[PDB]
Design an enzyme around this catalytic site. Structure first.
Site, PDB file in Angstrom:
ATOM      1  N   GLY A  44      43.987  40.378  46.988  1.00 18.82           N
ATOM      2  CA  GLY A  44      45.231  40.485  47.757  1.00 18.82           C
ATOM      3  C   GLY A  44      45.138  41.566  48.822  1.00 18.82           C
ATOM      4  CD  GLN A  49      46.585  46.937  50.679  1.00 19.39           C
ATOM      5  OE1 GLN A  49      47.015  45.828  50.379  1.00 19.39           O
ATOM      6  NE2 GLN A  49      45.533  47.487  50.080  1.00 19.39           N
ATOM      7  CB  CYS A  89      45.194  48.938  45.159  1.00 20.32           C
ATOM      8  SG  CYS A  89      45.988  48.909  46.800  1.00 20.32           S
ATOM      9  CG  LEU A  90      40.888  45.885  48.554  1.00 17.16           C
ATOM     10  CD1 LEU A  90      40.771  44.937  49.712  1.00 17.16           C
ATOM     11  CD2 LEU A  90      39.529  46.179  48.015  1.00 17.16           C
ATOM     12  CG  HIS A 131      49.345  45.087  43.808  1.00 17.97           C
ATOM     13  ND1 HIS A 131      48.728  46.019  42.989  1.00 17.97           N
ATOM     14  CD2 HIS A 131      48.846  45.292  45.048  1.00 17.97           C
ATOM     15  CE1 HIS A 131      47.919  46.774  43.719  1.00 17.97           C
ATOM     16  NE2 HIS A 131      47.984  46.367  44.971  1.00 17.97           N
ATOM     17  CD  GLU A 132      48.493  42.821  47.748  1.00 22.08           C
ATOM     18  OE1 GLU A 132      48.849  43.412  48.802  1.00 22.08           O
ATOM     19  OE2 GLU A 132      47.458  43.102  47.046  1.00 22.08           O
ATOM     20  CG  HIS A 135      50.649  47.186  49.231  1.00 22.41           C
ATOM     21  ND1 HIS A 135      50.272  48.515  49.186  1.00 22.41           N
ATOM     22  CD2 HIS A 135      49.737  46.516  48.499  1.00 22.41           C
ATOM     23  CE1 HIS A 135      49.173  48.638  48.466  1.00 22.41           C
ATOM     24  NE2 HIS A 135      48.847  47.438  48.018  1.00 22.41           N
TER      25      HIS A 135
HETATM   26 NI    NI Z   1      47.206  47.048  46.764  1.00 21.66          NI
END
Ligand code: NI
Length: 164
Positions: A44, A49, A89-90, A131-132, A135
């Site tokens: 994701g 991000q 998470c990236l 999760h996304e 963000h």
């Molecule tokens: Ni993330």
């Protein structure tokens, strides 16, 4: 394709603007996001991000482009059940934490062509969606940790980011 912001960064804490219209410029961000996401082996990504403060998410739970999801201006309409996995998470490389989530969600959003859809999800997909969406509201998985745990993560990444 795009650079991924590493926690801490202010643009990871911002509630993002909805997309005003899904045109070519938006589809380009979406394709650039998918490229970035696959290159870093994520499942994701959300636009903030990659430092774009809009309500745009790309998800690929299997990682092979055979059930892609673009969620533009997404909103969770309803949910139920309880679950939690060790999320990563990236933007928070090197860390995973157990986050409490809804097991099932119904979400509406616009697809890459601007068409509205309403999707029922469960399992890992539902977790990724929550999760996304977090963000897009400036929320990270570390926000569910104790202040001191989150701080220790932040210190470690501050250092990492210098050393890069
Ligand atoms: Ni993330």
């Amino acid at each position: 394709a795009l650079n991924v912001l590493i926690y801490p960064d202010d643009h990871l804490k911002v509630v993002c603007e909805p997309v005003t219209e899904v045109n070519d410029a938006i589809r380009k961000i979406v394709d650039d996001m998918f490229d970035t996401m696959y290159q870093e082996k994520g499942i994701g990504l959300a636009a903030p991000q990659v430092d774009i403060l809009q309500r745009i998410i790309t998800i690929d739970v299997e990682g092979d482009k055979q059930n892609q999801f673009v969620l533009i201006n997404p909103e969770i309409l309803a949910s139920e059940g309880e679950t939690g996995i060790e999320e990563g998470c990236l933007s928070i490389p090197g860390f995973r934490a157990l986050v409490p989530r809804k097991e099932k969600v119904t979400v509406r959003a616009l697809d890459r062509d601007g068409k509205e859809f309403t999707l029922d999800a469960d399992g890992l997909l539902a977790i990724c969606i929550q999760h996304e969406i977090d963000h897009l509201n400036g929320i990270l998985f570390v926000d569910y940790l104790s202040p001191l745990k989150r701080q220790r993560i932040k210190e470690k990444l501050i250092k990492y980011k210098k050393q890069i």
